Design a protein around this ligand. Structure first.
Ligand SMILES: [K+]
Ligand SMILES: [K+]
Ligand SMILES: [K+]
Ligand SMILES: [K+]
Ligand SMILES: [K+]
Ligand SMILES: [K+]
Ligand SMILES: [K+]
Ligand SMILES: [K+]
Ligand SMILES: [K+]
Ligand SMILES: [K+]
Ligand SMILES: [K+]
Ligand SMILES: [K+]
Ligand SMILES: [K+]
Ligand SMILES: [K+]
Ligand SMILES: [K+]
Ligand SMILES: [K+]
Ligand SMILES: [K+]
Ligand SMILES: [K+]
Ligand SMILES: [K+]
Ligand SMILES: [K+]
Ligand SMILES: [K+]
Ligand SMILES: [K+]
Ligand SMILES: [K+]
Ligand SMILES: [K+]
Ligand SMILES: [K+]
Ligand SMILES: [K+]
Ligand SMILES: [K+]
Ligand SMILES: [K+]
Ligand SMILES: [K+]
Ligand SMILES: [Mg+2]
Ligand SMILES: [Mg+2]
Ligand SMILES: [Mg+2]
Ligand SMILES: [Mg+2]
Ligand SMILES: [Mg+2]
Ligand SMILES: [Mg+2]
Ligand SMILES: [Mg+2]
Ligand SMILES: [Mg+2]
Ligand SMILES: [Mg+2]
Ligand SMILES: [Mg+2]
Ligand SMILES: [Mg+2]
Ligand SMILES: [Mg+2]
Ligand SMILES: [Mg+2]
Ligand SMILES: [Mg+2]
Ligand SMILES: [Mg+2]
Ligand SMILES: [Mg+2]
Ligand SMILES: [Mg+2]
Ligand SMILES: [Mg+2]
Ligand SMILES: [Mg+2]
Ligand SMILES: [Mg+2]
Ligand SMILES: [Mg+2]
Ligand SMILES: [Mg+2]
Ligand SMILES: [Mg+2]
Ligand SMILES: [Mg+2]
Ligand SMILES: [Mg+2]
Ligand SMILES: [Mg+2]
Ligand SMILES: [Mg+2]
Ligand SMILES: [Mg+2]
Ligand SMILES: [Mg+2]
Ligand SMILES: [Mg+2]
Ligand SMILES: [Mg+2]
Ligand SMILES: [Mg+2]
Ligand SMILES: [Mg+2]
Ligand SMILES: [Mg+2]
Ligand SMILES: [Mg+2]
Ligand SMILES: [Mg+2]
Ligand SMILES: [Mg+2]
Ligand SMILES: [Mg+2]
Ligand SMILES: [Mg+2]
Ligand SMILES: [Mg+2]
Ligand SMILES: [Mg+2]
Lengths: 50, 146, 64
RNA sequence: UGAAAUUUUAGUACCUGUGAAGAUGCAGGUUACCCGCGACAGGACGGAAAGACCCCAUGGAGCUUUACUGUAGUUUGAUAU
RNA sequence: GGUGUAGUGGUAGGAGAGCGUUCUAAGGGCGUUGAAGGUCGAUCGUGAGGACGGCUGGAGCGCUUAGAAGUGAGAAUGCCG
RNA sequence: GGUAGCGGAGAAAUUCCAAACGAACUUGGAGAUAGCUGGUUCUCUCCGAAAUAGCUUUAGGGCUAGCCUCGGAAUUGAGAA
RNA sequence: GUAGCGGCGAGCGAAACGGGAAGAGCCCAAACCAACAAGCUUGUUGGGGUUGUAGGACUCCGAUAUGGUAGUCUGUUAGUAUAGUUGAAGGAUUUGGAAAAUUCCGCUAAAGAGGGUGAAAGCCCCGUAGACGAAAUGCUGACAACACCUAGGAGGAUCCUGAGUACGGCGGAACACGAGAAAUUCCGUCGGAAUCCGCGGGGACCAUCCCGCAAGGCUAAAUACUCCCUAGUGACCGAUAGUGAACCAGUACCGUGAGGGAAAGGUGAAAAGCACCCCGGAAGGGGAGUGAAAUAGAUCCUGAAACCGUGUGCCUACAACAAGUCAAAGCUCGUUAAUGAGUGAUGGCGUGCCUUUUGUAGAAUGAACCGGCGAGUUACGAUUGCAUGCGAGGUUAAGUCGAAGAGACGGAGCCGCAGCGAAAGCGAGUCUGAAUAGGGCGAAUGAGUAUGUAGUCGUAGACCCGAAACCAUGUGAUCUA
């Protein structure tokens, strides 16, 4: 979800991790990723967006 | 899908045909243009409708008519489309635009009697055909010329 | 750029409901003493662009 | 000491015939051991120059005139100064 | 997949299906225990073409799926060497 | 030293104007235009012409039709012998 | 690509409305007032005033405020540009000349961007994430200061409101509009107004109506462009490519001059660039050395083909040969081990490739050979096929936010759902017609649309190369007249 800066920063540098905000998610990102780790608030915001 | 296993739908994409790439391809050498002539030249060919000097068809035919400056066209609506509304509903150009039936009303809505109306309605429009007015009123509705 | 319309044709033909082109008739300008009344009566009526002519010119009226 | 034009690859004969109708190369026959050197110029429709002759292109250019259309100049009138 | 019958010369040209080249993405790999490239070989496929060995070489390159093209030369009195 | 290309100069030859002057040279418009000539690069499979009519400042060009190819619709099956 | 313009040809081609980006409005001239000066007006100065629901002067009243600015090398302040500082984490084992590679255990990460290092490094180096930093000089923004603008109401008796102007004739030109029925705008020439009961415009012109107030000026933002500077990006080039120019390139060279205009990158990790010896006058070699490698020795990575030469397994001096192919003895050799390979006496058949042609072995054209380079592309539109989504519906464009992304919003607009008629107009009909007739085009009898992709077409150089030429700037009388 927006504003989770510490989570975003701490995760980004991992080679296998791609960080995206729930508001900015694209077909290419989802398809590239083998698994999707989402927070519950992020899922709520996604459901609202779609 | 997986980026390493993509597959387009069958027949969705085709391979471009490249000419002048050897004889066995069927477009080698002449590249399908044939042998000499005007149509075989780069940028060759005659302008559209040209007839090699025979008087073209449009020249043979006479001009006709004129355009009325005050021309008025009406967005047409038929009784079958009016059936989509409920009895007692007030049909209005705004109602039609909101319903998406008439995106562009032009000079105004004119109602025509193509189909069979079945609902009682009060219809407001720029114009009504005589048959359309009769059908609306016979269905127990009413018509008002906005 | 946008493909341009042939203005001469646009003045001389009309697009019909079925996609065809309605056209006037030739020989309807003058020298009527050289034509029988039957010819004049039957040239007064409009006609349609023939298949061959249409296939030559359709691209000039695409957006008429 | 050391070029050049040319050059599809060539183990590159003669006669008669054939063939896009004038063949070293195709047919029949004849002649001819292999490689050169000095000479000649019949042929390779030899080389050189996308024939200048001829015709064609709704090509070009220079020129002519009572070709067409313009026009610099020259002249005549009105008008302003 | 099997059987049967029929068919399969071809210029202009239409249709179809493929080979190979460079690059991008993803996946999965290979490389100083020798990549690409070069060279030789008596190898495989119906074709464009694909492997595998020996030698040379010395650092990058395949494969599968999809994508994009400066994507294939033997001729232009083509240009450069 | 002077005369400069819509030009100069010419005891006059279309003669000279930096080794080609019926209009210098250089750059630009400019990749002028070329119904004309040449060239146009991998493979296999299916089918496969035309060199005719009509009209054309048209005749070695072009347009429609005829002949080829690919897809589709439909029929009281209309084609061929 | 509509309305239109157009030898009504070829073509040319709007504007308003609507949706957005950005937004900002202000000064004079004149009337009139005060002063000044000369010669009751007439010039200078200051005030005054600025306009169309007419304004202003002028006359009455009342307020001496209220707000604003597109000003200032005026400071004060902040930020920023131009140097910088800091910045985590690895050792072993195998191959190797060299480890970053391999293998085993670790560690770091707000840093796994990137580059370099003796081969391919998150942890070796420069860096990166992040944190921090400016004496001096610019730039920006704020704050303040100074500065400059900033009045309401009521009356019209009178005065002012842009003159050789607007406008007209003639001749041109600009408006998509080529004189056309032609408005509107402008130029030259001539003629030549009104002024608020006024004037201009609403595409000849007139009347009515509506809208506006010319002949004076200024004005930021959205917009166009990049020689340069800084930081980056690329399904862009990789030494015949990419700038002409990766290299001392606009150089060499060419030309009187304008001007034209090249070629030319790579030793190795490190010069460790071969001490010394030998042949030779040297050049150049052979040893000896360096090096992992010298057939990496400076013409230096790799090192193809043409071309040239050395060695030889087979064949060749009675043969007429598009040079091969088919058959084949002999000899030689033994492979991706295949009913093998090289050569080949001898015999059969057999006139190259390409282009262009009715027809070419052609004595028709092109190629000396080898290598490289060298020709249907892209953008915007049209149309068809195929594919996907939605479906009587389909869809957004510009623009805003966002990584130069996707995506979201944006429905203005476009296509389709109704046609017929020249048009008024009518409408599942409509037009022709006197017609309930006939007939035409339509409906009955419905699929479209957005996007992708491919075929073809149009506009563009439009598949590539090629004129003689035309036009517009320049450079040339050092030859020659
Ligand atoms: K074709
Ligand atoms: K007509
Ligand atoms: K006539
Ligand atoms: K011949
Ligand atoms: K001779
Ligand atoms: K000449
Ligand atoms: K090999
Ligand atoms: K060549
Ligand atoms: K002379
Ligand atoms: K348009
Ligand atoms: K014309
Ligand atoms: K004032
Ligand atoms: K190091
Ligand atoms: K590194
Ligand atoms: K500063
Ligand atoms: K006019
Ligand atoms: K108006
Ligand atoms: K107005
Ligand atoms: K080497
Ligand atoms: K030999
Ligand atoms: K033989
Ligand atoms: K000849
Ligand atoms: K009727
Ligand atoms: K009818
Ligand atoms: K569809
Ligand atoms: K399409
Ligand atoms: K082009
Ligand atoms: K094209
Ligand atoms: K002289
Ligand atoms: Mg494509
Ligand atoms: Mg063919
Ligand atoms: Mg060829
Ligand atoms: Mg040809
Ligand atoms: Mg042809
Ligand atoms: Mg008439
Ligand atoms: Mg007759
Ligand atoms: Mg004969
Ligand atoms: Mg003979
Ligand atoms: Mg022979
Ligand atoms: Mg010969
Ligand atoms: Mg000759
Ligand atoms: Mg000739
Ligand atoms: Mg057969
Ligand atoms: Mg490569
Ligand atoms: Mg190419
Ligand atoms: Mg060559
Ligand atoms: Mg003479
Ligand atoms: Mg001379
Ligand atoms: Mg031009
Ligand atoms: Mg056949
Ligand atoms: Mg004619
Ligand atoms: Mg021909
Ligand atoms: Mg560090
Ligand atoms: Mg390690
Ligand atoms: Mg004009
Ligand atoms: Mg005038
Ligand atoms: Mg006027
Ligand atoms: Mg008004
Ligand atoms: Mg501005
Ligand atoms: Mg270069
Ligand atoms: Mg190279
Ligand atoms: Mg160059
Ligand atoms: Mg070597
Ligand atoms: Mg070398
Ligand atoms: Mg004998
Ligand atoms: Mg013998
Ligand atoms: Mg002939
Ligand atoms: Mg030749
Ligand atoms: Mg001079
Ligand atoms: Mg001189």
């Amino acid at each position: 979800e927006n504003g989770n800066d510490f989570a975003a920063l701490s995760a980004r540098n991992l080679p296998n991790v791609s960080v995206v905000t729930s508001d900015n998610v694209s077909v290419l990102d989802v398809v590239s990723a083998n698994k999707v780790l989402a927070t519950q608030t992020a899922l709520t915001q996604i459901e609202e967006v779609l | 899908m997986k980026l390493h296993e993509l597959k387009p739908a069958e027949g969705s994409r085709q391979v471009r045909n490249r000419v002048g790439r050897g004889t066995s391809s069927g477009n080698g050498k002449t590249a399908g243009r044939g042998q000499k002539g005007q149509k075989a030249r780069s940028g060759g060919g005659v302008r559209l409708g040209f007839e090699g000097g025979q008087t073209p068809l449009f020249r043979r035919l006479p001009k006709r008519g004129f355009t009325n400056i005050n021309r008025k066209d009406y967005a047409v609506v038929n009784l079958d489309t009016l059936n989509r509304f409920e009895d007692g509903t007030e049909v209005t150009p705004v109602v039609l635009k909101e319903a998406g039936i008439v995106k562009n009303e032009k000079a105004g809505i004119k109602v025509l009697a193509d189909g069979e109306l079945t609902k009682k309605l009060t219809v407001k429009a720029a114009k009504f055909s005589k048959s359309a007015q009769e059908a609306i009123e016979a269905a127990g509705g009413s018509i008002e010329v906005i | 750029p946008k493909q341009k319309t042939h203005r001469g044709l646009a003045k001389r033909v009309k697009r019909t409901g079925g996609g065809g082109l309605k056209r006037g008739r030739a020989f309807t300008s003058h020298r009527f003493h050289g034509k029988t009344k039957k010819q004049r009566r039957q040239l007064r009526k409009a006609s349609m662009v023939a298949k061959g002519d249409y296939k030559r010119i359709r691209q000039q009226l695409a957006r008429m």
